[PDB]
Write a protein that binds this ligand. Structure first.
Ligand SMILES: Nc1nc2c(ncn2[C@@H]2O[C@H](COP(=O)(O)OP(=O)(O)OP(=O)(O)O)[C@@H](O)[C@H]2O)c(=O)[nH]1
Ligand SMILES: Nc1nc2c(ncn2[C@@H]2O[C@H](COP(=O)(O)OP(=O)(O)OP(=O)(O)O)[C@@H](O)[C@H]2O)c(=O)[nH]1
Ligand SMILES: Nc1nc2c(ncn2[C@@H]2O[C@H](COP(=O)(O)OP(=O)(O)OP(=O)(O)O)[C@@H](O)[C@H]2O)c(=O)[nH]1
Ligand SMILES: Nc1ncnc2c1ncn2[C@@H]1O[C@H](COP(=O)(O)OP(=O)(O)OP(=O)(O)O)[C@@H](O)[C@H]1O
Ligand SMILES: Nc1ncnc2c1ncn2[C@@H]1O[C@H](COP(=O)(O)OP(=O)(O)OP(=O)(O)O)[C@@H](O)[C@H]1O
Ligand SMILES: Nc1ncnc2c1ncn2[C@@H]1O[C@H](COP(=O)(O)OP(=O)(O)OP(=O)(O)O)[C@@H](O)[C@H]1O
Ligand SMILES: Nc1ccn([C@@H]2O[C@H](COP(=O)(O)OP(=O)(O)OP(=O)(O)O)[C@@H](O)[C@H]2O)c(=O)n1
Ligand SMILES: Nc1ccn([C@@H]2O[C@H](COP(=O)(O)OP(=O)(O)OP(=O)(O)O)[C@@H](O)[C@H]2O)c(=O)n1
Ligand SMILES: Nc1ccn([C@@H]2O[C@H](COP(=O)(O)OP(=O)(O)OP(=O)(O)O)[C@@H](O)[C@H]2O)c(=O)n1
Ligand SMILES: Nc1ccn([C@@H]2O[C@H](COP(=O)(O)OP(=O)(O)OP(=O)(O)O)[C@@H](O)[C@H]2O)c(=O)n1
Ligand SMILES: [Cl-]
Ligand SMILES: [Cl-]
Ligand SMILES: [Cl-]
Ligand SMILES: [Mg+2]
Ligand SMILES: [Mg+2]
Ligand SMILES: [Mg+2]
Ligand SMILES: [Mg+2]
Ligand SMILES: [Mg+2]
Ligand SMILES: [Mg+2]
Ligand SMILES: [Mg+2]
Lengths: 247, 247, 62, 247
């Protein structure tokens, strides 16, 4: 047999490269997943991730409350945090014993998989009572924020998209929904009559994950890297695996 | 009047039979419900049921966590079960005090109502972090598992469909979504332009139920039988009520 | 060892001890107790008996 | 075939009678069990039973403490009951908040199976510090109390032996061991050189049971009767099953 790495007959090399490219392009076919992550960062270094994975389109919607830090199996000042919420929903509406809940997110990173079309991304970033733009009457239900999404890159390749916004001010009190549509370069509408009911089934079949990790290092080590997810850490370092035409 | 049970003029008998047949065929018209149940069986004999009932299409999606036994009003090792989850999401990622959580399901039975078209059934059976096939990139968001669904039968009649799979191995750690479409023998697409918005309303109008029953006997006695649901118990006995052309 | 002494006991942690009393009454006599479970996970799933090589296997009694 | 209950050829009747007689006489062979029960009766109506079942010889030994009522899963004044014990072990030795612990037994019934030889019964009925007769120096380690054992009778047959003594006085503070030897009408000593090591194995193989029942009715219904044990209730009624030559 030909020696490894010296000829057009290294079939192990050609298969390796096809194996990786096949996974890049399957993700981005209409058969593949489109995935969204919302990361809520808390002042204690912990990070709530909510991930949803689904065909055709994917999104996450969460209330002001659902985004607040919740420590499973530990004390969470739950009574006072009820009081806290009443004072966020309306100025001076509650009877808390704190000025600022450390359970409130300090920042949010929204990441999409490279199977999204960035021009289809929409965000409903509401106030604490779930109203996108001050009053329901003049609220457009979303904003098309795709222009703000940076490319997460590894080796020259787009491994995903990131929109990051801090919430460092006392009035940065939010509810949050975010939506993206899987890339479709074809003129076959995945939600036209022929395939619309499969899209209704993708709503049911969308798989969800969430968990609070103790630290960004633990997210990087045990959430992002094991699963080949894209990430952009606080120091602006890109995580992901470049697959297209590589070994 | 003619004597009961001796003539074509037993109108009480004919109405009884029509009453039952009408309910069989209404279920299976496009006006009727399609229903899915997921049963999570725990090692303590208890059973979580999640039921969803809705028009046109129905499904259930649950995370690895949401499927774990939760005993309302009683102790659940919640801190340690947080630790447990971190070790299921990533090998050696947590600090639990147990090798195996008894809160993990030992088996799953998926049942559909007889109004489903078995060929439309799709399952997203993910890993513990909500990825259908090892990595998102090469994951088809579902598998069409209808061929594995056994008919639940009573009196010669299909009272529903059952897919049952055990989770008896230590690595049988799953998230789960399952979807089915209501029977439509017509060429009227329920999700074509004329009726698509009614299908979007069925997404909102889908009614959900869940509860943990203490034992399969209690499920059979107090969940399945009172409501005329189909079931298949551990001893392979079929429960349901045959309605089509019977009194 | 008694039926009870063989059941899982987690030192320093919660063991549903009241309910596990109820559980035992229902194992000692059918429907004799008022437990909130069908099967105690504290019950052994298997037993291995091992002897040292200094035993005469013909003298073993259970 | 001959009609039932009319001839010497009712072989079902003869087998029934042999089946019962075989169990009577097997119990009483050197192959059979000898069994002892100690019942501690508490002022709240509850009853601790300690049962030991073993070949050749059987006994039970319990400290003053081990005989006190212990309510599994419920509060037991355990700190104060430590204080209580110090005051029973030595006059004015503790700092309790009660004059009389209701955890102290009010009565004791010792029952043996009909496989015992009543002349071999021995009791070590000690003081609260486990000394049979006031001081160790002049203590005979036991008393042969068999003469006080009443026959429990059902249908003319001895179904066991009972010794019952109340502890209704404040100074009736006891530790308790009791021993009996299985009937041996032969001149084969079960503890002579030929069989002595089997007797040492019966020490290991002796099976033990204990549990606190809530009431004598519950003992009669769910401990005694299901297992065909002998009993003598407070109203002097004999429980047991007569087996010898009966159907
Ligand atoms: N492309 C390139 N890579 C370099 C160079 N020097 C070091 N590297 C390392 O080599 C890695 C990729 O090299 P290769 O994969 O073998 O080259 P390639 O550009 O992918 O070309 P092919 O594999 O032949 O298709 C990079 O990620 C670098 O870290 C260089 O001069 N050019
Ligand atoms: N069909 C049938 N049922 C029997 C027979 N023997 C006992 N059965 C019982 O009778 C039940 C149904 O009988 P029917 O409903 O009166 O008969 P059918 O087959 O439904 O016919 P129709 O009611 O006239 O339409 C079954 O579920 C059986 O348990 C038998 O020989 N044939
Ligand atoms: N022995 C006897 N039993 C009676 C009499 N009258 C009612 N019985 C009841 O019958 C039961 C036992 O009767 P049997 O077993 O048939 O008679 P037996 O004395 O055992 O004699 P065999 O069975 O022939 O060996 C007793 O427990 C009584 O409750 C009677 O006059 N004599
Ligand atoms: N020294 C080099 N000279 C030329 N090309 C290189 C060199 N190193 C890597 N490359 C190639 O150039 C392309 C870009 O790779 P590169 O790793 O620099 O980008 P990246 O990972 O997206 O960003 P960054 O390295 O700035 O974090 C790839 O094909 C890579 O293999
Ligand atoms: N002895 C019989 N002979 C003929 N037909 C019967 C008999 N018993 C029931 N049937 C009829 O045959 C059909 C099948 O009924 P059956 O109860 O045997 O099926 P099932 O309930 O689906 O399955 P299974 O009894 O094996 O659990 C029905 O119409 C029923 O009324
Ligand atoms: N009326 C009777 N006349 C003669 N013998 C009887 C009568 N009733 C029962 N027997 C028999 O006499 C023997 C003694 O039985 P019996 O039930 O009276 O004694 P027990 O159960 O030990 O005591 P008790 O009935 O006083 O509680 C047995 O063989 C029984 O079958
Ligand atoms: N504004 C507040 C806040 C708290 N509390 C009291 O604080 C006690 C305990 O604090 P809690 O808010 O309940 O939090 P923790 O008990 O510390 O922890 P957890 O979330 O598990 O309850 C509660 O009984 C509540 O009555 C109160 O009276 N008024
Ligand atoms: N790996 C673990 C597991 C448990 N714990 C401690 O265990 C204590 C109680 O157990 P927990 O896991 O909280 O469960 P329970 O209290 O028994 O019941 P519940 O789910 O209602 O809290 C907690 O305070 C927690 O600090 C711990 O320190 N480390
Ligand atoms: N059949 C049952 C079982 C439990 N309980 C109540 O459950 C409460 C707490 O559960 P328990 O069985 O005592 O176990 P834990 O408290 O969870 O843990 P531990 O074994 O340390 O007591 C007890 O107060 C008891 O009254 C009850 O009323 N009836
Ligand atoms: N002579 C005594 C008796 C009791 N106590 C106090 O009583 C408190 C609670 O009573 P305890 O004797 O411990 O019984 P319970 O708590 O009621 O129930 P349990 O047996 O489960 O502990 C203990 O903290 C103990 O400090 C005391 O200080 N001095
Ligand atoms: Cl495609
Ligand atoms: Cl219709
Ligand atoms: Cl013998
Ligand atoms: Mg806890
Ligand atoms: Mg690089
Ligand atoms: Mg509670
Ligand atoms: Mg049948
Ligand atoms: Mg402890
Ligand atoms: Mg308790
Ligand atoms: Mg009698």
């Amino acid at each position: 047999a030909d020696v490894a790495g010296t000829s057009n007959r290294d079939f192990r090399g050609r298969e390796q490269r096809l194996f990786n490219s096949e996974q890049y392009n399957y993700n981005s076919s209409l058969n593949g997943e489109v995935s969204v992550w919302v990361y809520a960062y808390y002042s204690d270094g912990s990070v709530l991730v909510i991930n949803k994975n689904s065909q055709y389109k994917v999104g996450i919607s969460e209330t002001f409350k659902a985004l607040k830090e919740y420590r499973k199996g530990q004390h969470n000042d739950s009574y006072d945090e009820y009081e806290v919420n009443q004072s966020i929903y309306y100025p001076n509406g509650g009877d808390a014993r704190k000025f600022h809940s450390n359970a409130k997110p300090r920042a949010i990173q929204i990441i999409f998989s490279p199977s999204v079309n960035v021009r289809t991304i929409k965000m409903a970033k509401g106030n604490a009572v779930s109203v996108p733009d001050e009053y329901l009457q003049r609220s457009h239900p979303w904003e098309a924020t795709g222009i703000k999404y940076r490319k997460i890159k590894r080796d020259g390749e787009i491994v995903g998209y990131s929109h990051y916004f801090e919430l460092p001010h006392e009035y940065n009190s939010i509810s949050l929904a975010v939506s993206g549509v899987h890339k479709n370069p074809s003129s076959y509408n995945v939600g036209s009559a022929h395939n619309v009911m499969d899209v209704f089934q993708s709503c049911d079949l969308a798989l969800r994950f969430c968990n609070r990790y103790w630290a960004e290092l633990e997210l990087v080590n045990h959430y992002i890297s094991p699963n080949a997810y894209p990430y952009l850490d606080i120091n602006n370092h890109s995580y992901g695996v470049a697959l297209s035409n590589r070994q």
